[PDB]
Design a protein around this ligand. Structure first.
Ligand SMILES: C[C@@]1(C(=O)Nc2cncc3ccccc23)CNc2ccc(Cl)cc21
Ligand SMILES: [Cl-]
Ligand SMILES: [Cl-]
Lengths: 298, 302
């Protein structure tokens, strides 16, 4: 029993964290094979012009107490790729994957190439992450683990004025309408990840919390009209299908659970809690709930 | 900016997780140097569990009865001993991934990261606190026994917990790495119940200071309180008494935010009386008590 916000074991990613220093700026880099990936703003804008003025010896890469020698540099979108002479012997089986909003991933927060913490979070529908980052965290990465393969999905670039965070996939493409420059940028109005709230309601049922269940069912049309009204993301047939296993395990159809969520939105919790929370949690995907309530290992 | 429930990077602990099998029971072990630590109940059947005599059951075991697996390699047990509720299996290979480590026993309110494992394989990492009733509110399934709680301050892993059991309420009980249980619990299937849980007051105040540091000030008020008046009010909401030790510990956060401890205590009294009124503090509609004063400073400063 128990339901916790749980991150993937960070070991395979810790072996890849290095410190990248260029001029006065120090941030984190991801060392995979003979390449170190990091935010291109470490060179700080006309990034092609600024990068052409840099030489390999301008970038100081440190892996533990060992300095790696940079033998090449290139830019792919907002990520800088520093070719090094030594392949990381701790390189795990990995992929670069771009995730969708509502998808969750673990963040290994680093400072000076050293991992300091690990937390689980979701790519908000407004493409920001509500992370926890101090100055020097840039280059910290977000990932998932699929069997024994680390899928790198995020690299931290900046903090928006509201305290939320923005970054790119490992190909340097930003999540959201953000740019890597000091300019007026604002996160759009956020919405709730509906499929994730339903997955979390199924996790609560699996854990014995049933007070919110009701005799009612609804249609995807009637539910989405209510979802739009309460700044909840539309629930697609894809989402209903993904919730299928949890629906079969708990005996509560997805539209039956949707009627529970509909009542929770129109009436509130009434002093009650679900899994120790007075708010509806939306940072557990249907796959996270299955993984945690069945015991998948890495 | 931002405030998250954050666990320590689990890498140093992952390299120590192994699978321990004795008879029909399979659970997790912690492999440090040439010793594998695991709950001693691995030597029990479900029949032995009501009133087990562990000295008697262990004397009947031989080294070849314990099968230890580190990845796809079987380790050879060359000795076995029991220290309180932990079984120590001496092995013929020192773990090359052994980090710098310590065994530390923590007090209620202290937080730690848990690396949840099944069959010697890490499946997840989360943040916990030792509840005042000495249980932990974990996320554990059958087979998680032997999963450990730790803190990684600097480059040394301080092992503070090993999971042993789930109480009837879904809360969890375990021991330090010396086999001493936290709480009035025993490693038997006898009727055991967690005492009434209370909110960790010093941790809630630390979390209110974290919210002030992050720009949330709505809950602040012009009032102060005596320590005794605060405790008379807090006790009524099932909150732990706040000691002078706790007030002293909150000192640095009080200096950083400019809000005296007894002044923040008056905000807490008001929050307990009024509730949140549709508002949230650091994205939470409840008062969070699983961040210590040390966690807040580490997260909000480095
Ligand atoms: C092995 C056992 C135990 O609590 N296992 C579990 C431990 N953690 C989570 C679980 C969830 C679901 C079922 C079991 C779980 C069984 N009864 C008992 C009694 C005493 C001791 Cl010291 C250990 C145990
Ligand atoms: Cl004992
Ligand atoms: Cl302690």
């Amino acid at each position: 029993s128990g339901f916790r916000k749980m991150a993937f074991p960070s070991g395979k990613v810790e072996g890849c964290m290095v410190q990248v220093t260029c001029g006065t700026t120090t941030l984190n880099g991801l060392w995979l094979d003979d390449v170190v990936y990091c935010p291109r703003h470490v060179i700080c804008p006309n990034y092609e012009d600024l990068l052409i003025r840099k030489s390999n010896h301008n970038f100081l890469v440190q892996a533990g107490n060992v300095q790696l020698r940079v033998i090449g540099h290139s830019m792919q979108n907002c990520v800088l790729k520093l070719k090094v002479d030594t392949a990381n012997p701790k390189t795990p089986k990995y992929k670069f994957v771009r995730i969708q909003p509502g998808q969750t991933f673990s963040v290994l927060a680093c400072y000076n190439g050293s991992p300091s913490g690990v937390y689980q979070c979701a790519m908000r529908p407004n493409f920001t992450i509500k992370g926890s980052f101090l100055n020097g965290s840039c280059g910290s990465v977000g990932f998932n683990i699929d069997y024994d393969c680390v899928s790198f999905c995020y690299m931290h670039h900046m903090e928006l004025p509201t305290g939320v965070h923005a970054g790119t996939d490992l190909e340097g493409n930003f999540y959201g309408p953000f740019v890597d420059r000091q300019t007026a940028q604002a996160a759009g109005t956020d919405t709730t990840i509906t499929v994730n709230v339903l997955a979390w309601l199924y996790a609560a049922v699996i854990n014995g919390d049933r007070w919110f269940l009701n005799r009612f069912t609804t249609t995807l049309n009637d539910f989405n009209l209510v979802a739009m009204k309460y700044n909840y993301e539309p629930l697609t047939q894809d989402h209903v299908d993904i919730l299928g296993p949890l629906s079969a395990q708990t005996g509560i159809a997805v539209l039956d659970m949707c009627a529970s969520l509909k009542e929770l939105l129109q009436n509130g919790m009434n002093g009650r809690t679900i899994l120790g929370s007075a708010l509806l949690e939306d940072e557990f995907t249907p796959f996270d709930v299955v993984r945690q309530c069945s015991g998948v290992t890495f």
